[PDB]
Amino acid sequence: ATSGSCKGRCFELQEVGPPDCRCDNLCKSYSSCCHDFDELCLKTARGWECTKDRCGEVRNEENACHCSEDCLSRGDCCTNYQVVCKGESHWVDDDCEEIKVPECPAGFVRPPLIIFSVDGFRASYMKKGSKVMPNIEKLRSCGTHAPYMRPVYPTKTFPNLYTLATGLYPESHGIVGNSMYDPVFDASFHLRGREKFNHRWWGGQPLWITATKQGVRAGTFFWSVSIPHERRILTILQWLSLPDNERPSVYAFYSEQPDFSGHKYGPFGPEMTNPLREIDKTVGQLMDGLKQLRLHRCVNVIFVGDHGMEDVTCDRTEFLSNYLTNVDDITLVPGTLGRIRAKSINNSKYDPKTIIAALTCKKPDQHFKPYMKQHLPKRLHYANNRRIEDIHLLVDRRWHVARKPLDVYKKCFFQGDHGFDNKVNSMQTVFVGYGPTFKYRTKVPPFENIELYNVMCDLLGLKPAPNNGTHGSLNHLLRTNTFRPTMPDEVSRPNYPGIMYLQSEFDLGCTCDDKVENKLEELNKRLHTKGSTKERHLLYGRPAVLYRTSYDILYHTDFESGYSEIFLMPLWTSYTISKQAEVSSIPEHLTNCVRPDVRVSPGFSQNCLAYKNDKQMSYGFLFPPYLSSSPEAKYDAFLVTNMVPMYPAFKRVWAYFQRVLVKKYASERNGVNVISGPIFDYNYDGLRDTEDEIKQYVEGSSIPVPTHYYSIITSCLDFTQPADKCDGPLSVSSFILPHRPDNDESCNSSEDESKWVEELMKMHTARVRDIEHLTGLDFYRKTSRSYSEILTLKTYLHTYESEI
Numbered sequence: 001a002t003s004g005s006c007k008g009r010c011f012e013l014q015e016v017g018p019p020d021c022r023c024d025n026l027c028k029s030y031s032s033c034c035h036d037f038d039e040l041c042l043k044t045a046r047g048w049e050c051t052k053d054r055c056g057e058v059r060n061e062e063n064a065c066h067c068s069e070d071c072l073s074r075g076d077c078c079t080n081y082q083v084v085c086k087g088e089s090h091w092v093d094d095d096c097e098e099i100k101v102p103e104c105p106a107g108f109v110r111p112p113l114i115i116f117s118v119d120g121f122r123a124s125y126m127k128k129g130s131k132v133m134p135n136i137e138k139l140r141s142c143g144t145h146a147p148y149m150r151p152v153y154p155t156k157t158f159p160n161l162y163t164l165a166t167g168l169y170p171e172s173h174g175i176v177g178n179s180m181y182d183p184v185f186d187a188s189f190h191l192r193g194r195e196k197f198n199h200r201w202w203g204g205q206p207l208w209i210t211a212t213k214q215g216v217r218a219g220t221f222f223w224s225v226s227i228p229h230e231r232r233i234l235t236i237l238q239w240l241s242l243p244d245n246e247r248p249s250v251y252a253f254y255s256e257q258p259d260f261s262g263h264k265y266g267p268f269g270p271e272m273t274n275p276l277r278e279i280d281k282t283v284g285q286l287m288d289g290l291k292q293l294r295l296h297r298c299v300n301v302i303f304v305g306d307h308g309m310e311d312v313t314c315d316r317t318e319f320l321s322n323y324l325t326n327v328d329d330i331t332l333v334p335g336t337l338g339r340i341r342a343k344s345i346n347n348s349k350y351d352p353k354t355i356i357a358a359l360t361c362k363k364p365d366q367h368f369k370p371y372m373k374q375h376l377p378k379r380l381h382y383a384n385n386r387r388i389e390d391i392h393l394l395v396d397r398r399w400h401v402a403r404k405p406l407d408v409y410k411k412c413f414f415q416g417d418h419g420f421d422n423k424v425n426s427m428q429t430v431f432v433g434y435g436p437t438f439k440y441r442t443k444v445p446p447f448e449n450i451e452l453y454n455v456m457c458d459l460l461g462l463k464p465a466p467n468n469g470t471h472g473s474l475n476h477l478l479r480t481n482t483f484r485p486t487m488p489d490e491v492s493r494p495n496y497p498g499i500m501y502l503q504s505e506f507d508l509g510c511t512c513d514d515k516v517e518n519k520l521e522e523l524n525k526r527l528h529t530k531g532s533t534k535e536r537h538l539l540y541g542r543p544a545v546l547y548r549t550s551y552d553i554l555y556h557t558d559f560e561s562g563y564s565e566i567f568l569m570p571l572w573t574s575y576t577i578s579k580q581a582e583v584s585s586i587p588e589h590l591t592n593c594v595r596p597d598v599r600v601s602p603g604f605s606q607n608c609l610a611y612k613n614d615k616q617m618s619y620g621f622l623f624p625p626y627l628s629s630s631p632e633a634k635y636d637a638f639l640v641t642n643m644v645p646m647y648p649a650f651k652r653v654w655a656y657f658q659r660v661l662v663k664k665y666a667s668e669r670n671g672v673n674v675i676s677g678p679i680f681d682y683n684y685d686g687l688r689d690t691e692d693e694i695k696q697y698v699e700g701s702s703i704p705v706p707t708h709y710y711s712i713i714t715s716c717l718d719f720t721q722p723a724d725k726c727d728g729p730l731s732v733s734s735f736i737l738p739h740r741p742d743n744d745e746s747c748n749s750s751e752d753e754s755k756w757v758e759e760l761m762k763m764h765t766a767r768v769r770d771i772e773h774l775t776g777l778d779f780y781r782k783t784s785r786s787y788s789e790i791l792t793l794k795t796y797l798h799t800y801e802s803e804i
């Protein structure tokens with residue numbers, strides 16, 4: 001019923017309720033604009049730039065923008081008015097000058113924030129397109145910038161833009177792809193279409209809502225595609241001239257480019273130079289406009305992309321029809337990732353287990369890997385949502401998967417795409433922050449886009465809703481307004497047991513050839529059990545236990561552990577391996593040795609009988625016997641308190657890691673400190689399980705089986721200092737290995753471990769923060785480093801990609 005009028009209402013900030021017609025920046029998308037929207041709100045007469053002959057002109061309300069004398073006071077000049085008509089310079093031509101304080105017009109309560117988001121803007125464009133982007137290159141070199149920013153998985157538009165707005169992983173905000181089926185709604189969601197407009201798809205609390213609830217006004221962030229970029233900028237500039245009580249403090253501009261073109265031409269197509277020139281020109285208009293309003297040293301500007309773009313063509317498509325015979329009983333969400341479910345729920349013959357088996361390592365060159373979603377690398381955080389299908393296909397970069405060849409030619413067209421694993425270099429995108437609140441000429445290390453919501457909240461004095469960022473981890477981007485995080489309080493204190501049990505009290509069915517057994521060396525043994533070498537093996541203090549539980553600290557010559565009396569195994573084991581340390585073998589006579597620990601009761605210990613009786617399950621050790629400091633220290637590594645349950649298929653991975661890789665890293669990094677332990681995440685929510693969530697135990701026992709094993713390997717960033725004598729910043733790499741009864745994930749697994757184990761571990765790289773969530777532990781509690789710096793270390797991901 002669109003018979004009302006947009007007179008005095010163009011780009012109104014609250015949308016009026018149907019069936020009265022709308023004049024907001026979204027009305028075109030709902031086909032609901034008033035009849036005179038175009039005429040009044042979308043003026044194009046005379047274009048977007050003042051020329052010499054328009055200077056001082058008589059206001060003509062029909063023009064797109066104005067060059068008349070009164071346009072400044074009306075706030076609707078063309079962005080280049082002062083340059084063409086008042087002999088002013090373009091913002092880009094001015095030297096940069098540090099903005100030490102905001103320089104805002106009277107009546108501004110805080111520096112406004114403008115988010116300039118660019119679709120498909122790959123990180124390497126900053127260097128490779130630099131010659132054609134002078135405005136963006138100035139923002140970058142004068143402000144604060146990262147070499148790149150990591151998107152979330154899938155590296156698609158919708159999941160990423162909503163992550164930027166909410167600080168949440170897609171699994172938690174609910175936008176888990178560009179397309180989705182929700183079985184509870186029984187409803188679908190598509191990028192094109194009208195179902196995306198329904199609010200039930202959208203979880204968490206995005207920045208515009210956070211702002212409004214806390215009394216900070218927001219511009220409407222979303223723009224109908226047909227509103228030209230120049231008009232989007234002019235609207236933002238007009239809103240910024242509104243009276244104090246109506247003027248928003250936060251705005252977004254959005255560009256469909258360079259993504260639109262990247263799909264057609266590939267990331268580096270020669271056609272790609274023009275779209276980059278044009279985005280830059282848009283940035284130029286914004287900054288020229290701000291400089292006219294005297295706001296160019298007042299506004300914080302963020303220039304931020306959602307994902308990169310990779311070379312992908314028709315001929316690089318794998319087909320599920322070349323693998324499966326029941327192809328018609330499945331529905332595939334296709335392309336740069338795959339999600340598979342049953343075509344129909346009344347068909348009880350469809351079986352996920354046999355689907356995965358049919359797609360596993362079937363061709364020597366296979367360009368995708370099938371996964372049950374709970375087995376995907378935990379760093380992707382891509383499982384805990386009913387909209388994510390049980391079966392997922394991780395697709396190689398540069399490839400697609402499709403169901404049938406017909407789907408690809410009857411449903412080439414494209415040379416670029418994205419969606420791949422968020423560790424892939426081509427998927428990385430950009431971040432620049434410019435303004436009074438950001439640092440001056442400062443480079444910062446790469447970080448994840450989940451972190452930005454907190455910083456945007458900080459920029460606006462807002463308290464962020466609960467999110468997946470680690471607040472404080474990006475304080476180094478900011479001149480001021482930092483948020484001063486504090487360490488979580490330890491919840492459980494440890495017990496420190498001494499010798500309390502005699503060996504004969506234990507009936508564990510365990511045996512060791514150790515009775516083949518002096519106040520020189522017994523005086524030594526006693527010190528080692530009280531913590532005399534603890535300074536060596538626990539470098540950053542004990543991890544804090546952030547939940548209620550019962551555990552013991554156990555000291556040894558070569559290692560220290562936090563032993564859970566509830567889970568019957570360590571929550572963590574800490575040890576340092578110097579560059580000079582030697583690897584030894586496990587002597588023949590000690591092959592099956594397991595020794596009772598006289599500090600811990602029989603009832604709180606594992607037993608060997610359970611393993612003997614459990615045909616599927618074996619056991620491994622957290623501190624490795626291979627790295628013992630001496631033949632006598634080696635007996636400690638065989639304590640029942642150092643033992644953990646491991647599938648034999650997993651033992652192969654773990655033994656190679658402990659025998660070969662630990663020593664390799666100590667060699668390369670000049671010593672390493674290792675913390676290892678189990679993870680239980682049976683409901684795949686990325687958070688430590690309570691005992692009543694455990695779905696598997698060693699047969700006949702109360703010994704819970706971990707879903708994963710982690711290690712955190714820390715050393716000195718300046719590797720001329722040894723790990724145990726480091727004066728400055730730390731360096732860390734970590735992993736969360738899935739504890740699986742087979743090695744089907746590794747197609748090369750029947751070859752020697754030196755050909756596949758390390759590749760598996762790299763796939764399963766993790767942030768310390770991911771391990772924290774999964775264990776309820778807090779690491780690096782006692783260092784000489786600032787807490788903000790430690791938060792940054794905890795969010796670091798070692799990616800094993802070459803250098804961008």
Ligand SMILES: *[C@@H]1O[C@H](CO)[C@@H](O[C@@H]2O[C@H](CO)[C@@H](O[C@@H]3O[C@H](CO[C@H]4O[C@H](CO)[C@@H](O)[C@H](O[C@H]5O[C@H](CO)[C@@H](O)[C@H](O)[C@@H]5O[C@H]5O[C@H](CO)[C@@H](O)[C@H](O)[C@@H]5O)[C@@H]4O)[C@@H](O)[C@H](O[C@H]4O[C@H](CO)[C@@H](O)[C@H](O)[C@@H]4O)[C@@H]3O)[C@H](O)[C@H]2NC(C)=O)[C@H](O)[C@H]1NC(C)=O
Pocket residue numbers: 168169171172173174200201202203204381384385386466467468685686687773
């Ligand atoms: C990443 O960061 C987020 C945010 O901090 C973390 O997610 C939070 O996790 C906590 C702890 O588990 C959740 O607490 C539980 O809350 C529910 C009530 O939840 C409702 O209210 C909140 C608050 O407004 C909403 O955000 C919730 O929204 C969810 O559901 C709607 C659909 O209804 C949807 O629009 C959203 O996308 C969102 O979905 C996601 O979360 C749900 C689970 O909550 C999940 O099923 C889904 O797959 C999505 O991932 C919602 O409207 C409450 O019922 C629970 O109490 C129960 O457990 C207690 C034990 O304490 C029992 O005593 C009791 O009997 C209850 O059964 C929880 O307290 C919180 O909801 C959640 N927030 C969000 C936004 O997801 C992640 O954990 C972080 N991830 C990592 C890896 O760290």
Ligand SMILES: O=C(NC1CCCCC1)OC[C@@H]1C[C@@H]2CCN1C[C@@H]2C#CC#C[C@@H]1CN2CC[C@@H]1C[C@@H]2COC(=O)NC1CCCCC1
Pocket residue numbers: 115117157158161162164165196197198199202203204205206209221222223224252253254
């Ligand atoms: O133009 C912009 N600017 C961006 C700047 C950077 C931040 C995000 C937006 O984006 C281009 C958009 C993004 C999406 C993909 C491509 N293209 C169309 C798509 C869509 C849509 C779209 C839409 C409409 C706008 N609001 C409201 C109406 C629908 C749905 C949506 C979501 O609204 C709530 O989130 N409210 C809820 C959320 C949870 C709290 C309670 C209220």
Ligand SMILES: [Ca+2]
Pocket residue numbers: 680681682683684685686687688689
């Ligand atoms: Ca869990």
Ligand code: NA
Pocket residue numbers: 510511512592593594
């Ligand atoms: Na034995």
Ligand code: NA
Pocket residue numbers: 611612613614615616617618
């Ligand atoms: Na066994």
Ligand SMILES: [Zn+2]
Pocket residue numbers: 120157259260263418
């Ligand atoms: Zn795209």
